[PDB]
Structure formats: structure tokens, C-alpha cells
Amino acid sequence: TCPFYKKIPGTGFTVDAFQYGVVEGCTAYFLTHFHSDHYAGLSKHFTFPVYCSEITGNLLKNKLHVQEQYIHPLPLDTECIVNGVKVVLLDANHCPGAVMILFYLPNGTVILHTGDFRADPSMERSLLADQKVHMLYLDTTYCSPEYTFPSQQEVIRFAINTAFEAVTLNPHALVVCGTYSIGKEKVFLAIADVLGSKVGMSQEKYKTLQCLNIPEINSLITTDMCSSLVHLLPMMQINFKGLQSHLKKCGGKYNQILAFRPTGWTHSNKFTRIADVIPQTKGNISIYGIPYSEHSSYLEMKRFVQWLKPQKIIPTVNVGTWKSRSTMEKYFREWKLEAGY
Numbered sequence: 323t324c325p326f327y328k329k330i331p332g333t334g335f336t337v338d339a340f341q342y343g344v345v346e347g348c349t350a351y352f353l354t355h356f357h358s359d360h361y362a363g364l365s366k367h368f369t370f371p372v373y374c375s376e377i378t379g380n381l382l383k384n385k386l387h388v389q390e391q392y393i394h395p396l397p398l399d400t401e402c403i404v405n406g407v408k409v410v411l412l413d414a415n416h417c418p419g420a421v422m423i424l425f426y427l428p429n430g431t432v433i434l435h436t437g438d439f440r441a442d443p444s445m446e447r448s449l450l451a452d453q454k455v456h457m458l459y460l461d462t463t464y465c466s467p468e469y470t471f472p473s474q475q476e477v478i479r480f481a482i483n484t485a486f487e488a489v490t491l492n493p494h495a496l497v498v499c500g501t502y503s504i505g506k507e508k509v510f511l512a513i514a515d516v517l518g519s520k521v522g523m524s525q526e527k528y529k530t531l532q533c534l535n536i537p538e539i540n541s542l543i544t545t546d547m548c549s550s551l552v553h554l555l556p557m558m559q560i561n562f563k564g565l566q567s568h569l570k571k572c573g574g575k576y577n578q579i580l581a582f583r584p585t586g587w588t589h590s591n592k593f594t595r596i597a598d599v600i601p602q603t604k605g606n607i608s609i610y611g612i613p614y615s616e617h618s619s620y621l622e623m624k625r626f627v628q629w630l631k632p633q634k635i636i637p638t639v640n641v642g643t644w645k646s647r648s649t650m651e652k653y654f655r656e657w658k659l660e661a662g663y
């Protein structure tokens with residue numbers, strides 16, 4: 323049974339609610355982005371209307387084989403009428419094709435569902451600037467002040483400089499980057515660009531990347547691993563055993579691996595600056611964990627909500643424990659008292 327925080331009151335609509343079977347009363351199913359916790363349940367046998375971005379729609383059709391007749395892509399930043407209700411999709415600054423959804427209820431209520439997002443001051447100048455929001459369905463993944471991490475730009479600066487140094491010292495070093503879903507593509511694309519290489523990867527991963535409308539992509543990626551000195555591998559293989567085994571396969575072309583694991587937040591964030599990050603090393607293999615986040619830090623979250631001034635907040639993440647829920651509710655009230663709404 324579908325939980326309440328995936329239902330939009332006063333509509334026939336659900337958000338990210340594909341694993342509950344046929345939801346009673348649902349005339350349109352929205353999908354914010356193509357991450358498995360959110361799409362869980364979609365397949366070629368789904369026969370209800372799915373509303374999403376163009377990029378999400380490319381992925382539904384090519385990766386999950388959803389039939390074309392049930393996929394309804396919408397342009398961003400554009401007022402659209404769905405089953406008699408005005409909606410707008412906004413960029414969520416999450417993974418490619420990820421959106422927030424503004425719903426303009428027939429009774430005059432305005433609702434924002436963030437999906438998964440990384441808040442940014444640029445959102446304060448989208449179509450959100452123009453009206454009041456009564457209810458906010460909020461990605462609270464990192465809603466506690468211990469969650470700090472650097473900008474995405476500082477993280478990519480670290481990665482490019484690290485990769486370029488290592489390979490210039492040893493032209494026989496291979497760079498490897500971990501992946502398990504879409505998102506975080508700037509990591510491997512930025513490093514390949516500084517090295518003058520294409521990124522090499524499996525046919526399944528190449529297929530996924532070809533659905534993402536990234537400019538000039540045929541110029542940046544390839545399935546010919548032999549022509550590439552930046553390889554992508556599944557995240558599970560980014561360990562000393564898995565990397566050793568990969569290096570065997572490269573036929574003595576390389577004698578060192580430098581590897582990157584983009585994580586979310588990790589507790590080494592509470593002590594160490596990005597500049598000071600060091601790898602784990604065994605022999606001719608080094609692994610860097612880099613805190614490249616596609617979710618709001620606590621401060622970024624707080625700034626967005628204090629700017630938006632919603633009347634009511636409904637968390638969509640960390641909702642399963644009473645201690646989590648109580649913690650989040652305390653921060654929401656602080657924010658409201660400090661800002662005066």
C-alpha cells in the first residue's frame with residue numbers, strides 16, 4: 323500500500339509510486355528521476371500514463387522497455403495541463419533528467435515536490451519566485467548539521483589535479499572510476515578531458531549514457547577499452563581485489579591504478595578538508611573516496627526552505643524512525659522561528 327507522502331491531495335496523482343501495484347484513484351503516475359528506489363516496479367507491462375522529463379523518458383523506453391504510448395515527456399520551465407491540473411517541471415540539480423514538480427491545485431493550494439535535489443541559490447530565480455507555496459514535500463536525506471561537504475566544483479578540481487599529476491608522473495598508470503547508477507558523470511568526464519582520453523565502459527553503461535542528451539557525448543565515451551586510459555567499472559569492483567583483477571586484463575599496458583569512489587557524505591567529512599584527502603594504498607593500487615554529493619547539505623537545505631517559507635513540510639527521506647522524524651521536526655521549527663514565517 324502506497325504511503326501518504328507519495329500522494330498529492332486533491333488530485334488523481336502519485337509521485338515515485340510504482341511498487342504498490344494499481345494505486346486506487348491514480349490517473350497519472352509521476353516519476354521525478356531514474357534511480358531504482360524511485361522507479362521500483364516499472365517494466366514493459368506497465369499500462370498507465372507516466373509523466374516525466376524527456377531524459378527520464380529516454381531511459382524508461384530504452385532501459386526498462388516501457389512502451390512509447392504510456393510515456394508522457396514534458397519540457398522544463400513550462401506550464402502544462404495534466405488531467406485538468408496545471409503542473410510545472412523544474413531542474414532538481416540531482417542526476418540527469420531529475421525534476422522537481424509544482425502542482426497548482428484546483429482549490430488554490432500550490433504544492434512543490436522536490437523529488438531528490440541538491441538545493442542551490444539559482445532556484446530562487448526559477449518560476450518559484452512568482453508565487454506562494456503552501457506544502458513542500460522535501461528531500462531530507464542530509465537534514466542534520468553534521469552533514470557538511472564541499473561544492474561539486476571543489477571536488478572536481480581535486481579529482482582533475484590528482485589524476486593529471488599521477489598520469490604525468492607515470493604515463494603507464496590507468497585511472498578507474500566507480501559507478502552504480504546515473505548521476506555524478508562530471509567525475510569521469512572531467513578526468514578524461516584533462517588526460518585527452520575517451521572514457522571506456524561496458525556496452526550496458528554506454529547505452530545508459532547515450533539516453534542522457536549530453537552535448538558532444540560521442541566525442542567523450544567509448545566501448546573500446548583498449549583505446550581509453552580512463553575506465554568505468556561497477557562500484558562493487560572498486561576495492562584492491564577487484565582492481566588487481568582488472569589490471570590483469572589490460573595485457574601489460576599498465577603497471578599502476580589510480581581509482582575513485584564518489585560516495586555521498588562519509589564521517590571523514592567531520593574532520594578532513596578536501597585539500598587534505600588521502601587515498602588507501604596497497605602496492606601499485608590507490609583508492610580515493612571523494613565526497614561528490616547530488617543531495618543538499620544541511621546548510622543548502624536550510625537556506626532554500628527559509629527562502630521558500632512553506633506553510634507545511636512533509637519529509638520524504640528518513641521517515642521510518644521516530645527519532646529521525648522528531649529530529650527533522652525540531653529543525654523545521656528552528657528555521658521557521660529564526661526567519662519569522
Ligand code: NI
Nearest residue numbers: 355357416438
Ligand atoms: Ni536519487
